[PDB]
Structure 1
Amino acid sequence: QCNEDNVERDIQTEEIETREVWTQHPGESTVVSGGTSDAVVMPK
């Protein structure tokens, strides 16, 4: 048999991880956020 072997292969690329993000130039202190300890006040 001339075709002594016929090696099959499967190939799969990986996926790309993406996220949705907000931004806005005019606004509040927290510009954008992804779609109660309050220890933040204590230092002042």
Structure 2
Amino acid sequence: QCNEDNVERDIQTEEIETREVWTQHPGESTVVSGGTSDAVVMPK
């Protein structure tokens, strides 16, 4: 048999991880956020 072997292969690329993000130039202190300890006040 001339075709002594016929090696099959499967190939799969990986996926790309993406996220949705907000931004806005005019606004509040927290510009954008992804879609109660309050220890933040204590230092002042």
CA shift, 1:29, in A, is 0.0
Unaligned runs of 5+ in 2: none
Using structure 1 for the length normalisation, give the TM-score: 1.00
* Cα distance in 2 for residues equivalent to 1:7 and 1:13: 20
Q: Deviations over 1:12-41 (max 9, x none)?
A: 000000000000000000000000000000
Paired residues in the alignment total 44
Identity of aligned residues (%): 100
CA-based RMSD of the aligned residues comes to: 0.0
Unaligned runs of 5+ in 1: none
Using structure 2 for the length normalisation, give the TM-score: 1.00
Spell out structure 1 runs of 4+ moving beyond 6 A: none
Name the one with the larger strand percent: 1
